[PDB]
């Protein structure tokens, strides 16, 4: 029987997902104009166009964040990775939700992620590249952050600050976690043998 642990203990899927999330985050930041367009250069990934920042500290921040996400994926401790767009008052305006499920057993009847990784992931990238045509216009001056929704059961005897790979993370507060009954915009869903992933956007109502 083929199991998730058979693919290098979850490291393959964690490495593929962090590669993907880096590119997807960059593209979100471009199309939503979180940063000036001049920092992004055109590249290819998954044989499709992508737009990637050349700003060193932005780049390193995104890599550092994903460095912390990688072990959480390897231990199967991630339900969602969310790119949260915050307005100038620091309130969430929009959320790009990457909903990730890694079952312990491979799904038999589903497409092979590893034989078809470019085509499968490209689909998500192409949707992001044109999403501005289905979303509302963000107010000026938005910023972003990244929320990781884990599988760990919460337990009220808990320290807000959690250090991962020497970077301090925090339990996310009401100011970010809460959107007032948002509108859900589906972008893309995939079910493959190893990985189920859904991308959708939450927009403030």
């Amino acid at each position: 029987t083929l199991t998730r642990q058979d693919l290098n203990f979850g490291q393959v899927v964690a490495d593929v997902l962090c590669e993907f999330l880096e590119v997807a985050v960059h593209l979100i930041l471009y199309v939503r104009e979180v940063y000036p367009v001049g920092i992004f250069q055109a590249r290819k990934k998954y044989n499709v166009p992508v737009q990637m920042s050349c700003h060193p500290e932005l780049n390193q921040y995104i890599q550092d964040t994903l460095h912390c996400v990688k072990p959480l994926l390897e231990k199967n401790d991630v339900e969602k990775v969310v790119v949260v767009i915050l307005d100038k008052e620091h309130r969430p305006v929009e959320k790009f939700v990457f909903e990730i499920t890694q079952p312990p057993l491979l799904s038999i009847s589903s497409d092979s992620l590893l034989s078809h990784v470019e085509q499968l992931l490209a689909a998500f990238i192409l949707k992001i590249s044109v999403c501005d045509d289905v979303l509302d216009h963000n107010p000026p001056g938005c910023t972003f952050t990244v929320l990781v929704h884990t599988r760990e059961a919460a337990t009220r005897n808990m320290e807000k600050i959690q250090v991962i790979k020497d970077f301090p993370w925090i339990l996310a507060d009401e100011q970010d976690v809460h959107m007032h009954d948002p509108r859900l915009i589906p972008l893309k869903t995939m079910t493959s043998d190893i990985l189920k992933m859904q991308l959708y956007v939450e927009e403030r109502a």
Partner: peptide, 25 residues
């Protein structure tokens, strides 16, 4: 039954920081 949701304590570089870098060349 709630799960732990976490975010970085530190912000990404601000838009203005990046604007200064770009304009500088």
């Amino acid at each position: 039954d709630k799960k732990i949701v976490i975010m970085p304590c530190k912000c990404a570089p601000s838009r203005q920081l990046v604007q200064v870098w770009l304009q500088a060349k």
